[PDB]
């Protein structure tokens, strides 16, 4: 699943310019909900820990990969739930 060096390098700078630019002009009241939403996105680290656990051959590799999938899964699920709760604050009162 690897891309070449130069293509990967383009992908790195373009995504970096992009992430920076999408946050200019965020209003102050969205600072913490955005931190939380962006926190949930880097949650996708669970996937890379899945591949590690999935190729692990020894007890140690398995144990370290097992722990990473838990940690990754926690970031994704808890980060999702927290962000959903904060963004209820962009509604009224039923």
């Amino acid at each position: 699943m690897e891309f070449g060096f130069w293509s990967a390098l383009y992908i790195f700078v373009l995504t970096c310019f992009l992430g920076y630019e999408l946050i200019t002009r965020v209003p102050v009241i969205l600072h913490t909900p955005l931190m939380s939403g962006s926190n949930f996105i880097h949650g996708v680290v669970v996937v890379g820990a899945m591949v590690v656990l999935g190729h692990a051959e020894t007890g140690l590799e398995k144990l370290i990969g097992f722990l990473g999938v838990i940690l990754g899964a926690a970031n994704a699920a808890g980060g999702y739930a927290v962000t959903v709760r904060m963004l209820e604050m962009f509604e009224r009162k039923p």
Binding site: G19, Y20, T32, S38, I41, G43, V44, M50, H55, Y80
Partner: protein, 261 residues
């Protein structure tokens, strides 16, 4: 593996549209939803990766992590969301660190440059792990919120960072198991050291900064192991988080340098 590439392509788009929509008040609620679909598709696609085993371990770990995290998120008072961001952030940084540790232990890198990337993501993920745990413990009550100051702390912290970086670099020449374990333990200790002097009111900035760090770590692991889902999402959040930390500092009347050192 065109279908996994296609899936990951779709995930990056959903995260980008999600992030964009979260930055504006009128579309913010919908933005977490687009992002959530991306995460579901990423996890689903990943079971089809070539050569995967340990499917029961994987599924068990996914379930343990996500149920307990979900269970904690929905039961805490709303007033407690900044600390919950911290602990979930810490955990992701830990997850990047584990990817780097296993690959360094396997000696999986034939390329020196891909090795360096794996090493850098491991330092940064580790620091964010213990750094984010201290931020949580301080705001939660497990520790007091006040600065923990001492004789010659700045110099101690710098000396630990310098030593963490020397031992990390040395792995490019000799990757003995003892050196690996020592590098991680020193990066973990540094996360602790760095957050100790930070008081309660300054802690949102530090947490934003560790958020940026985990993103970067996730991105770096992505490039090192050749996973596009992590390359894009990690780089996107690293960059967005870096700026977001500057903005939070300016709004809270301060500098990032002032809080962090």
């Amino acid at each position: 593996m065109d279908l996994i590439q296609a899936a990951y392509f779709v995930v990056a788009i959903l995260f980008i549209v999600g992030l964009k929509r979260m930055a504006h008040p009128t579309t913010a609620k919908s933005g977490i939803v687009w992002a959530g679909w991306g995460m579901v598709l990423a996890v689903l696609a990943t079971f089809f990766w070539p050569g995967m085993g340990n499917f029961a371990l994987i599924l068990l770990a996914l379930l343990l992590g996500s149920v307990v995290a979900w269970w904690a998120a929905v039961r805490v008072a709303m007033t407690d969301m900044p600390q919950m961001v911290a602990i979930y952030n810490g955990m992701g940084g830990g997850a990047a660190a584990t990817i780097a540790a296993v690959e360094l232990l396997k000696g999986a890198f034939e390329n020196t440059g891909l090795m360096a990337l794996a090493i850098l993501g491991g330092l940064i993920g580790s620091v964010a792990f213990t750094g984010s745990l201290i931020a949580f413990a301080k705001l939660q009550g497990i520790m007091k919120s006040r600065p923990i100051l001492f004789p010659g702390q700045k110099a101690v912290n710098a000396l630990v960072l310098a030593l963490t970086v020397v031992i990390g670099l040395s792995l490019l020449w000799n990757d003995a198991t003892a050196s690996i374990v020592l590098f991680f333990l020193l990066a973990l200790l540094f996360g602790v050291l760095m957050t100790l002097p930070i008081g309660g009111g300054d802690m949102p900035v530090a947490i934003s900064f560790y958020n940026a760090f985990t993103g970067m770590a996730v991105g770096f692991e992505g490039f090192a192991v050749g996973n596009p889902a992590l390359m894009v999402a990690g780089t996107l959040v690293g960059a967005a988080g870096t700026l977001l930390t500057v903005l939070m500092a300016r709004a809270m009347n301060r500098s990032v340098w002032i809080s962090v050192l």
